[PDB]
Amino acid sequence: IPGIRAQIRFIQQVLEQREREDTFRLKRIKGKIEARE
């Protein structure tokens, strides 16, 4: 059961990894289009 929270925890952080950082290469690209224009 603390197996659940365990490896499955790795789960939430590759998940979370994936995008507050991915979602950001992006708010900033679009800036970048007419941010650059």
């Binding site: 679009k30 289009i33 007419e34 224009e37």
Partner: protein, 450 residues
């Protein structure tokens, strides 16, 4: 009147006219080309110059090259004889037959005819698919999208509806308009063969736009299709069903030119005008004046990257009366058709069901199946959390009901289920649940139908 190219950047060409400027939307013809090259006016830049979008490649154009104004937009050669023919996105023959002999020549933007009445969609369209007819009934005048993703058989469903759809005893004749956008040569050959072999072609007009056809021709495809539908419905009094696959591919082309047009991009790189261009297509549906005919749409919306929140599929939802959403996860479990029973809705469903339409218990059965399937799906999560053996007896029944719903109700061995057949399967699976747990079926229906 003639003009001269002053600038060329990919699909966008600027053209200067010394006399008479062509109005926005006019089709211009480039002189000196082996194959016809159309330029559609998009803007008046000032200084007698217009900005245009090419319908085919611009390689080989030179500054100073001559251009003539045709005096009109691109147009539809309208006639009842459109039925039985296969055409390109621009309405040119693809079936080795002669060009259409027009009864009228109609503009294609939606301005012609002013066909729509200010009346609500109503009455049945029998698709011949149980998961539509029984649970999410398509109604005459409605816009009911198929919501899917890459790899899923959305086009098989679209083709099957095209073959099977009818308007059961209607005094009005029925027709199909099938438009495909950005499809492969293999897919085009398949669609053609299917219409010809089945004899579905006799009551259909088919427009096929290939992936390598000009991007502008793809943009015009849905407009040719909707104009033909409105003509048949309004001038011939027909109930017309329009099937448009894939709206996402239409959007990829429109998006492709927005950059060449000088616009600042919006979210996800899309055109800032995404919703007001898309509105020009979803606005074109409903009962027509006279109430003898109607235009119904079944647009296919594939999720790019399977993301139903992408601006394209997300803005399409408002244009529909029924939505059928397909899911890759469900398809991977071997459940076909891969319809998400908790994300498919009938906005206008209540207008096509009940006594004198389907059957009096239809709403109650639909409500109970939806509720039980949603609970059953959540319990699949709970099983994963606690284990199968720790689930209560009552929850186990709902868990099992979800499998029964998928195995027996969703799955059809290709097969034309009447609404009576579909309600019968629904009641049969409902028996798996405790009668005391049928919260959404009044006792009157349980006694009469259980």
């Amino acid at each position: 009147e003639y003009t001269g190219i002053t600038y060329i950047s990919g699909p966008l060409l600027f053209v200067e006219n010394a006399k008479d400027l062509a109005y926005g939307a006019i089709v211009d013809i480039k002189d000196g080309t082996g194959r016809v090259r159309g330029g559609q006016v998009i803007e008046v830049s000032e200084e007698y110059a217009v900005i245009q979008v090419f319908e085919e490649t611009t390689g080989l154009d030179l500054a100073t090259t001559s251009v003539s104004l045709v005096e009109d937009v691109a147009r539809l050669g309208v006639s009842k004889e459109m039925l039985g023919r296969r055409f390109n996105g621009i309405g040119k023959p693809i079936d080795g037959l002669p060009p259409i002999t027009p009864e009228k020549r109609l503009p294609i933007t939606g301005l012609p005819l002013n066909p729509v009445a200010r009346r609500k969609p109503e009455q049945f369209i029998q698709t011949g698919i149980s998961t539509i007819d029984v649970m999410n009934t398509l109604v005459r005048g409605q816009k009911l999208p198929i919501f899917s993703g890459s790899g899923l058989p959305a086009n098989e469903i679209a083709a099957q509806i095209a073959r099977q759809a009818t308007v059961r005893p209607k005094e009005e004749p029925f027709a199909v308009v099938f438009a495909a956008m950005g499809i492969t040569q293999r897919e085009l050959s398949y669609f053609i063969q299917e219409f010809e072999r089945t004899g579905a072609l006799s009551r259909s007009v088919l427009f096929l736009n290939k992936a390598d056809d000009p991007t502008i021709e793809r943009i015009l495809t849905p407009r040719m299709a909707l104009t033909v539908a409105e003509y048949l419905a309004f001038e011939h009094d027909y109930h017309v069903l329009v099937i448009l696959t894939d709206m996402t591919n239409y959007c990829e082309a429109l998006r492709e030119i927005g950059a060449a047009r000088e616009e600042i991009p919006g979210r996800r790189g899309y055109p800032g005008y995404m919703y007001t261009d898309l509105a020009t297509i979803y606005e074109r549906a409903g009962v027509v004046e006279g109430k003898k005919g109607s235009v119904t749409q079944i647009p296919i919306l594939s999720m790019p990257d399977d993301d139903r929140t992408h601006p394209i599929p997300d803005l399409t939802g408002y244009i529909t009366e029924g939505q059928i959403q397909l899911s890759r996860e469900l398809h991977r479990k071997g459940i076909y058709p891969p319809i998400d029973p908790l994300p498919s809705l009938s906005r206008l469903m209540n207008n096509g069901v009940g006594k004198g339409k389907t059957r009096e218990d239809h709403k109650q059965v639909s409500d109970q199946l939806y509720s039980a399937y949603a609970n059953g799906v959540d319990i699949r999560k709970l099983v994963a959390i606690i284990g199968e053996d720790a689930l209560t007896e009552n929850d186990r029944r709902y868990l099992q009901f979800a499998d029964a719903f998928e195995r027996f109700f969703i799955n059809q061995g290709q097969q034309n289920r009447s609404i009576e057949e579909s309600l019968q399967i629904a009641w049969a699976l409902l028996s798996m649940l405790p009668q005391g747990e049928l919260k959404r079926i009044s006792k009157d229906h349980i006694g009469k139908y259980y």
